[PDB]
Write a protein that binds this ligand. Sequence first.
Ligand SMILES: [Cl-]
Ligand code: NA
Ligand code: NA
Ligand code: NA
Ligand code: NA
Ligand code: NA
Ligand code: NA
Ligand code: NA
Ligand code: NA
Lengths: 245, 118
Amino acid sequence: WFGQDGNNYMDIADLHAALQVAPDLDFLFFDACFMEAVEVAYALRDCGSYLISSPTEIPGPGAPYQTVVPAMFSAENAALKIASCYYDYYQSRYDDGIGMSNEDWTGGVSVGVAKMSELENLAVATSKVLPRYITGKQNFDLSGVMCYDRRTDKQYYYDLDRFIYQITAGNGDYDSWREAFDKVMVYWKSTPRNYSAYAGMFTMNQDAKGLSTYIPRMSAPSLNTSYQQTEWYKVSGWADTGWYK
Amino acid sequence: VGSRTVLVYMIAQNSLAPLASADIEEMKEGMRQVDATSGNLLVYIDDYSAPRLIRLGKDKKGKVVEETIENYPEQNSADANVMKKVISTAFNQYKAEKYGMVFWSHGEGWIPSPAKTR
Ligand SMILES: [Cl-]
Ligand code: NA
Ligand code: NA
Ligand code: NA
Ligand code: NA
Ligand code: NA
Ligand code: NA
Ligand code: NA
Ligand code: NA
């Protein structure tokens, strides 16, 4: 979901429905947690050109709007300039979380920009992989696959690229898929570590690409069911895996 | 025309409410080095007081000033039709060559709402 108004939270489907009255946007900047997800990118691919957020947690003080606002009004490449501004600010003050606070953020940050128009190609690419390499229903061996979710009782978001790499053992099918994915993330920068309000400073794996994905798990059948409601699920090939078929 | 309109949508009626003010002030500061004749920065802010749609324009002296576009009764800003109304008001009043939108709140990816009715 996105947005919390008291005890209300906007489902992504409802958000998409709302953005239909919006003109086509150059960028959709989510100064909010966990929004750089393939499922959000795909669901909102028709609302704009670029998705800007973090696959993991966003710092409380958020964007340096003293520099981000001018970035938003650039002639062109606003999306890239928004991201680079956001990143450069926190990397300049990065001190591996020493003396971390809202008023002095030394925990760094990670920002990615996704090209929305390539999300359909990515869904096609992914559908060629998932049923073929996920024939059974079983918890995955996810060691080495960057987890953007530092809440060990949730662990919702994993790096999509590293996950596809894992299940294909980086074979020739990965390279094919990787070609399609390379066209999606146009920006991805991160400090060596980020700050989690749940776990503290955590390492951002150097091979992470900045776009998250969900992964089914035996512990959360209700959430596996909920994932069948996403539009990405319907086109990603997950329906034809051993987890859902 | 080179003009651009950006709506910043702040669902701040939460734990981030104390942080909303700083960002808005940072926006004014950033708006200073922005051509306020062609660039339109609109801000919807719903914190611990009544929602309001404003515009961060410059006065005739160049000082960044808040311009009230519409005031709202208290409402769920995480509701689609509420967002629709604000989006409609924002962009229809300020058509431009390019557009952008900022989403300012708590986030949890694709995950369904933790509270549902049936
Ligand atoms: Cl990890
Ligand atoms: Na995410
Ligand atoms: Na800020
Ligand atoms: Na920092
Ligand atoms: Na990794
Ligand atoms: Na692609
Ligand atoms: Na997926
Ligand atoms: Na309010
Ligand atoms: Na409200």
